[PDB]
Amino acid sequence: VNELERINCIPDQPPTKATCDQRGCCWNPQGAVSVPWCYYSKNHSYHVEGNLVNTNAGFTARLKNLPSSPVFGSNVDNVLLTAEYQTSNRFHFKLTDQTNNRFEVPHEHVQSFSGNAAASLTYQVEISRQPFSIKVTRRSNNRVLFDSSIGPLLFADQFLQLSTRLPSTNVYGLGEHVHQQYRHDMNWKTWPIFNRDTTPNGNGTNLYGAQTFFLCLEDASGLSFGVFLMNSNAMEVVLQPAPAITYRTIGGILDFYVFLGNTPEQVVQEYLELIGRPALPSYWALGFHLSRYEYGTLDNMREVVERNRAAQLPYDVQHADIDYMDERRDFTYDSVDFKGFPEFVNELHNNGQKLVIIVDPAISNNSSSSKPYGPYDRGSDMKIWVNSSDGVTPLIGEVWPGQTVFPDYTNPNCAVWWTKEFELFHNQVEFDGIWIDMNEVSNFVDGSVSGCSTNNLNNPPFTPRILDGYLFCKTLCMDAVQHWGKQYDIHNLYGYSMAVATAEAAKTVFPNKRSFILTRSTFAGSGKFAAHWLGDNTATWDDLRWSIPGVLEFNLFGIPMVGPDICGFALDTPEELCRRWMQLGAFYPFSRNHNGQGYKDQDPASFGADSLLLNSSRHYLNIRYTLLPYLYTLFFRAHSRGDTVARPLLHEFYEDNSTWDVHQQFLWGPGLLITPVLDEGAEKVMAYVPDAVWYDYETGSQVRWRKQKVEMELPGDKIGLHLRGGYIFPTQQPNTTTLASRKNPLGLIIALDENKEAKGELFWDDGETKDTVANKVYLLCEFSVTQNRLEVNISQSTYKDPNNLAFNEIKILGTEEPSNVTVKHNGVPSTSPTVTYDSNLKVAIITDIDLLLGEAYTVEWAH
Ligand SMILES: *[C@@H]1O[C@@H](CO)[C@@H](O[C@@H]2O[C@H](CO)[C@@H](O)[C@H](O)[C@H]2NC(C)=O)[C@H](O)[C@H]1NC(C)=O
Ligand SMILES: *[C@@H]1O[C@H](CO)[C@@H](O[C@@H]2O[C@H](CO)[C@@H](O)[C@H](O)[C@H]2NC(C)=O)[C@H](O)[C@H]1NC(C)=O
Ligand SMILES: *[C@@H]1O[C@H](CO)[C@@H](O)[C@H](O)[C@H]1NC(C)=O
Incomplete structure (x- = not known):
């Protein structure tokens, strides 16, 4: 071997x-x-017994274990393989117990398959029988994608394992962890997955969410594939340099999906087609968010809000953490320290800003006739708590308010209890969105206030290498009981079900609106309901660096609205780190400055009304806001087609192997390259410049660089931002809130490619109504430049913004002097626009123009 x-x-x-x-x-x-x-030896495990059976969907096989005494519990002697050719690019196979039903994830979006195997498959499947292996190859070039023959199939009641060889070491995904790099270290690495409240640090532990998807770029042609395991039991994934990956889980079944595409973006699209494409965010949720744990009093919170507004910082959203509550109890506010909370919320709304409130899942069980606590009383009447192993007594643990019980969000009536709690609280405090935290579920005692019984669930035969080495550590007993099943099977699904329930609540509380949900714990599919933040990071340079792979991975997972705590949650932040982080942070899809309890202020204005940090912060946040129409359109494509929003260089530049491990830079969509300074003391960054034409965002000048490493000069006040030739970027003049910025004139930036061509698009809808896309109430236009001519072409025109928006500026980069600019509307001329030309930089700006949003125009020039 x-x-x-x-x-x-x-x-x-x-x-x-x-x-x-x-x-x-x-x-x-x-x-x-x-x-x-x-x-493992060459002949360990199962063999096919008898013949494969053709089915409408694919085929089945009976697998029979070649006998062996128990290692990790009761082995399964007869396994059923069921294979479904679901689509041309998606294959599904599951390994179940022939004789017994086993736990299967009750996913809200994935449905069972009915009917017939897809025609025109891009893949071919081969079963070997002695011993069993399964292999999936790409039909066009015979590349073997999935091949389990490297190892055995193991299928015991509490130990299930399958391995696959891989075509390359370009492997991306799995979560939630701090991998520290984007492309996987394949040198014998094990990654446990089991949702857990822990610090995202250098230790490589299981964190808050569970994501089994990975994507493999097979070669420089771009051909790629993905693998998803639908399994919610504690598990670990083992990577080795064969190259190969092994999935090892402690329950459920092996339910695998294999996805093929021509490019990495296509694999992500196929994956999200299966598990659910992300929600389209409220346009305001794309603004800047500010927050901290423990302002302590409303006066302090209002002080921070007011200095950042006085600074004219772009700033849409204020979050309120558990300090707003009465003794950290959900659905209350502190009438002394937060006296006047409703008036403050009116003041936010009046200034065009939004309030997001934290809500934890655990509910104080401290209620008497003297001092009742309504949420506990109402939940207990509805009997919607998670129960101890007896099945009938609500399980007791401890979280922020003290002893607590936990809602069973898998129970349909729990969402009705939960909705009513929000409608009641919303009548007092008119919040705009919800931040759901501690939903791993996170417990300050292990298991419960009485601990956990010793049994095969709390103390299984095999425990993956999860932090602290026991399953119930800082969470619920594994034998706790919910409507979907025992905690042991559904632990990884708690935050997922909480997001589904919270989204359900929002149908009543914010009728017809997207609102905003931000969640800590995730499962495959969570992006359909919620944004994610990378958790309780630390104000170090390492945490800044580790944030980029974290954002990119969540974009693979269909949670494109993801960011860390800018400046770092734990620790006082140094000014230089916070300045660099604010600069990068302006370009995270979710942009929130959040700070832990007790540490020095890290809001931008806290550094000084005329500080470099504040000036640079406002500068790059204004750029972010200017580019919101482009960012929003990327979210539209994520939502409707399944594209990433923050995108690895390799998804656009895969033909170039220099991009395959780049993780200190990223793209917004196909067109905008972001190159932060990520080193203490540094005024330069070693960066890769891919093989395209690039333009400096601020000056518009073409860089000399192409397909090469460069040291990009980036002083204290700069982040690298470059626009890709070939692309048209819609922009809107910024203001300090999206409520106000959405009323401003629009612009186009045309970055010409080598052929003096470029293309782009703009999605526009009302920015807040849920399902404007499903119900087709939006505008979609296409921009294309092909020498001497810009065409504005409309493809869906069922929304007309009543604010009468128009493009009143067009900036063309990498162009020779345009002359005699004409504008035609529906092919009818036409008004002669002003053109300014910078011959040194090769930038033309067309102004004194008014192209109405939603109308077709041709703009033409000579040279
Ligand atoms: C950014 O924000 C808005 C409101 O926040 C807007 O201010 C308003 O502008 C008008 C002047 O042209 C005034 O009539 C109105 O009183 C004023 N309201 C204020 C200050 O509360 C700004 O014009 C807008 N600016 C940009 C650059 O779009
Ligand atoms: C947790 O225990 C409670 C009892 O405290 C169970 O409550 C039941 O709720 C259903 C639906 O409303 C009723 O029809 C039953 O009669 C209730 N039983 C009792 C004894 O009051 C609840 O089902 C339990 N949850 C789980 C998942 O087992
Ligand atoms: C890992 O966690 C420990 C606590 O167990 C902490 O002190 C340490 O700094 C962490 N290691 C890294 C590499 O971040």
């Missing part, structure tokens, strides 16, 4: 020969570091 292909047979202890012999595995301690000493 090649040592890189050994599949570790002793994942559960230090390897020894005795155990190896006992398990019937192979023993060879003569390998390199991390190479498994004890590994």
Whole structure:
């Protein structure tokens, strides 16, 4: 055996020969570091029994275990393989127990397949029988994508494992972790997945969410594929340099999907087609968000709001953390420290801003006739709590307010209880959106206030390498009971069900509106309901750096609205770090400055009315706001087609192997390259400039660089921002709120490619109504430049903004002097616009023009 292909047979202890012999595995301690000493033999596991059966959907096979005494509990002697050719580019197979039903994820979006195998498959599937393996190859070039033959299938009641060889080491995805780089380290790495409230630090632990999807770029042609495991039990994923990946889970079934595409963006599109495309955000949620844990009093909160408004900082959203509550209890506010909370909210609204309030899932069980607590009383009447293993007594744990019970959001009546809590509280405080936190679910005691019984659920045969080494650590007992099943099976689904329920609440509380939900814990599919933030980071330069792969991975996962706490939640932030982070932070899809309890202020205005940090912050936030129409259109494409929003360079530049591991730079969509300074003391950044024409965003000048590493000069007040030739970017003059900015004139920036062509598009709707896309109430136009001519072409025209918006400026980059500019409307001329030309920079600006939004125009020039 090649040592890189050994599949570790002793994942559960230090390897020894005795155990190896006992398990019937192979023993060879003569390998390199991390190479498994004890590994599976060539004939371990299952074989196909008899013949495969053609079905309407694909085929089934019966798999029979070649006998062996129990290692990690009761083995499954007869396995059923069911394979479904669901679409031309999506294959589904599951391995179940022939004789017994087992837990299967009750996903809100994925449905079972009915009817017949798709025609025109891009993939071919091959089963081997002695021993069992499954292989998926790309039909066009015979590339083997999925091939399980490298290792055994293991299928015990609490230990399920399958491995696959990979065509390349360009592997991206899995979560939620701090990987520290974007392209996977394939050198014997294990990543546990089990939702858990822990710090996103350098330790490589399981964090708040569970994401099994990864994407593999097969080669420079762009051909790519993805694999998703629909399984919500604690699990770990093991990467090795064969290259290969192994999924090892402690329950449920092995339910896999394989996705093929011609490009990385196509794989993401196929994945999101299956699990659910992300929600289209409220346009205001794309503005800047400010927050902290423990303003302490409303006066303090209002003081921060007011200095940042007086600074003229673009600033749409204020979040209120648990300090607003009465003794950290949901659905109350502190009538002394937060006295006047409703008036303050009116003041936010009057200034065009929005209030987002935190809501935790755990509910104080401290209620008496003397001092009742309505949410507990109402929830108990509805009997909607998670129960102890007895099935009938609500489980008791401890969170912010003290002893608490936990809502069972898998119960349909829990969403009705939850909705009523919000409608009641909203009548007192008119919040605009909801931040759901501690929803792993996070418990300050292990399991419950009485601990956990010793049983195969709380103390399973195998425990993946999760933080602290026990499943119920800082969460619920694994034998706790909910409508969807036992905690052991549904733990990873708690935050997911909470988001579904919260989205359900929003149908009543904000009728017909998208509102905004931000969640900590996620499962596959969570992006359909909620934004995500990367959690309780730290004010260090490492955390700044680690944020970029985190944002990119969540964009693969269909949660494009994701960002960390800008400036760092834990710790006082240094001015230089916070300045650099604010600069980068202006370009995260979710942009929120958030700070932990007790640390020095890190709101931009706190650094000084005339400070460099505040000037640079306002500068780059104004750029962000100017580009909101482009960012919003990217979100429209995520929502409607499944595209990423913050995008790895490799998704556009995959033909260039220099981009395959780039993670200190990223794109907005196809067209905008962001190059932050990420090193302490630095005024330069080593950056890659891909193989395109690029223009400096601010000056419009063409950089000399192309397809090369450069040291980009970036002084204290600068971040690198470059526009890609070939693309047209719609813009709107900024203001300090999106409420106000949406009323301003629009602009186009045309970045010409080598052929003096460019293309772009603009989506426009009312920015807040839910399902404007499904119900087709929007504007979509296309811009295309092909020498001497700009065409504005309208493809969907069912929204007309009543604010009478128009493009009143067109900036053309990389152009020779335009002359004799004409404007035709519906092909009818026409008014002669002003043109300014900078011959040194090759930039033309067309002004004194008024192209109505939603109308077709031709603009033409000579040279
Ligand atoms: C950005 O914001 C708005 C409102 O916040 C707007 O202010 C208004 O502008 C009008 C002057 O042209 C006034 O008639 C009106 O009283 C004023 N309201 C205020 C200050 O509360 C700004 O004009 C707008 N500016 C930009 C650049 O779009
Ligand atoms: C948790 O325990 C409660 C009892 O405290 C269960 O409540 C039941 O709720 C249903 C639906 O309203 C009623 O029809 C039952 O009669 C209730 N039982 C009792 C004993 O009062 C609830 O079902 C439990 N939840 C789970 C998931 O087991
Ligand atoms: C890992 O966690 C420990 C606490 O167990 C912490 O002190 C340490 O700094 C973390 N390591 C890294 C590399 O961030």
